[PDB]
Amino acid sequence: AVDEEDFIKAFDDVPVVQIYSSRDLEESINKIREILSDDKHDWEQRVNALKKIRSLLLAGAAEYDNFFQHLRLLDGAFKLSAKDLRSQVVREACITLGHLSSVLGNKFDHGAEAIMPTIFNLIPNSAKIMATSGVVAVRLIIRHTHIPRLIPVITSNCTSKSVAVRRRCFEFLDLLLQEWQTHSLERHISVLAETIKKGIHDADSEARIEARKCYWGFHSHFSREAEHLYHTLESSYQKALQS
């Protein structure tokens, strides 16, 4: 979260560029694609191509009619970058993904769905910079890209063998319930309830605390369904919620 601020500060820490025409934009992005699409290509060049994506955003690339078509062709490049061996590349990719979500909002639906499992793969890394990059990128996407089909991606990770992943999954879920409006959730009530029920019984104390935060977030959206949930619990879990 000082981790989150850091990313956000990095959004515009990139060269100022001008977009002369839609044809130029198309060419600029295709070039970025070919740079990112070979992991033999130099790392600093790849880092710079990821930043140029951000420059293009700050120069209004989202206003160009075919921008989303060009962006979609970068999916391969994002997975490859986010899987890189060098944290310089990975982190820069996560900052750019966060910036894409921040700028495009719900229009980052496809890109967000395409990349999110790859960034979840970063969460359990014992290397701090790797795990933190993935965590912050997921938080930024949740914050700005309110796409229902992202819900199962997040919730599906909540039974991870990795307790770090479980803890993060419930933090993510708590953020999502706090940030997304009810209508964005209404197609996933059962899934939300089941995940929260499981978390409330987590063997891990930190996860349980986060899960209890999710319970109350869910309750505010869906009283009836949350109360039902509450009454299926043994009484000691009930008390932990009430308290």
Side-chain angles (χ1 to χ4, degrees), residues 38-54:
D38 176 39
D39 66 39
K40 299 288 101 168
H41 230 124
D42 183 56
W43 76 262
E44 250 174 292
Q45 276 186 25
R46 286 187 280 160
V47 162
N48 286 328
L50 287 165
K51 287 176 174 169
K52 195 179 173 186
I53 290 181
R54 306 211 297 277

Side-chain angles (χ1 to χ4, degrees), residues 71-72 75 78 97 107-116:
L71 182 57
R72 273 169 105 156
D75 284 343
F78 291 138
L97 294 170
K107 295 191 190 64
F108 194 45
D109 58 324
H110 295 129
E113 208 190 354
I115 194 61
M116 209 188 299

Side-chain angles (χ1 to χ4, degrees), residues 72-144:
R72 273 169 105 156
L73 299 175
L74 292 182
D75 284 343
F78 291 138
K79 283 169 113 80
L80 201 46
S81 298
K83 290 192 256 204
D84 200 80
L85 291 182
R86 282 202 170 70
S87 68
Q88 303 96 321
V89 177
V90 170
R91 182 171 184 268
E92 205 65 48
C94 293
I95 290 164
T96 296
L97 294 170
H99 192 217
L100 282 160
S101 174
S102 183
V103 172
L104 312 173
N106 289 0
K107 295 191 190 64
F108 194 45
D109 58 324
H110 295 129
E113 208 190 354
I115 194 61
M116 209 188 299
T118 299
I119 56 191
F120 267 83
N121 282 340
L122 297 176
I123 305 283
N125 201 309
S126 77
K128 182 65 175 321
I129 187 173
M130 291 298 202
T132 285
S133 295
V135 173
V136 168
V138 169
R139 296 186 54 92
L140 287 166
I141 284 162
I142 289 167
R143 203 176 283 281
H144 297 106

Side-chain angles (χ1 to χ4, degrees), residues 3-233:
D3 293 334
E4 209 161 315
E5 297 163 23
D6 286 355
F7 260 47
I8 300 173
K9 280 197 230 278
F11 285 170
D12 59 12
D13 195 22
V14 296
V16 173
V17 300
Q18 279 187 90
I19 300 171
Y20 295 125
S21 75
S22 66
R23 298 169 59 87
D24 284 5
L25 180 58
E26 178 167 355
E27 148 177 55
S28 284
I29 294 168
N30 185 75
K31 187 54 202 304
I32 283 168
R33 178 195 196 176
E34 45 192 59
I35 286 172
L36 295 180
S37 283
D38 176 39
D39 66 39
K40 299 288 101 168
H41 230 124
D42 183 56
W43 76 262
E44 250 174 292
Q45 276 186 25
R46 286 187 280 160
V47 162
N48 286 328
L50 287 165
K51 287 176 174 169
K52 195 179 173 186
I53 290 181
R54 306 211 297 277
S55 305
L56 288 171
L57 287 169
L58 292 157
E63 296 141 353
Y64 291 72
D65 296 6
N66 306 128
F67 169 73
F68 297 96
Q69 289 159 19
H70 309 324
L71 182 57
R72 273 169 105 156
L73 299 175
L74 292 182
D75 284 343
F78 291 138
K79 283 169 113 80
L80 201 46
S81 298
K83 290 192 256 204
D84 200 80
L85 291 182
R86 282 202 170 70
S87 68
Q88 303 96 321
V89 177
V90 170
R91 182 171 184 268
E92 205 65 48
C94 293
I95 290 164
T96 296
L97 294 170
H99 192 217
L100 282 160
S101 174
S102 183
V103 172
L104 312 173
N106 289 0
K107 295 191 190 64
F108 194 45
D109 58 324
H110 295 129
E113 208 190 354
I115 194 61
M116 209 188 299
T118 299
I119 56 191
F120 267 83
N121 282 340
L122 297 176
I123 305 283
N125 201 309
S126 77
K128 182 65 175 321
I129 187 173
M130 291 298 202
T132 285
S133 295
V135 173
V136 168
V138 169
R139 296 186 54 92
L140 287 166
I141 284 162
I142 289 167
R143 203 176 283 281
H144 297 106
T145 303
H146 297 194
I147 297 302
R149 53 174 31 225
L150 294 184
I151 287 163
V153 191
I154 298 140
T155 55
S156 69
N157 289 281
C158 285
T159 61
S160 174
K161 195 121 106 172
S162 161
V163 57
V165 170
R166 298 209 306 287
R167 294 174 183 161
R168 294 316 193 165
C169 187
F170 290 105
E171 286 162 14
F172 293 157
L173 177 55
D174 177 50
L175 176 62
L176 184 148
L177 290 162
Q178 157 191 316
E179 283 311 309
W180 294 24
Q181 297 201 295
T182 306
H183 71 80
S184 297
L185 311 179
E186 76 206 346
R187 287 227 148 167
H188 290 79
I189 301 175
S190 170
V191 165
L192 290 165
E194 276 318 292
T195 302
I196 292 171
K197 183 154 98 123
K198 197 73 182 244
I200 290 164
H201 300 96
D202 206 278
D204 183 74
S205 184
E206 279 166 36
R208 293 199 299 274
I209 292 176
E210 294 303 315
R212 292 193 289 260
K213 293 183 211 173
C214 293
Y215 171 83
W216 286 113
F218 178 73
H219 187 289
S220 73
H221 287 288
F222 300 115
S223 304
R224 183 177 91 258
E225 294 87 344
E227 289 288 343
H228 178 40
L229 200 174
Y230 177 92
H231 292 115
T232 69
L233 279 53

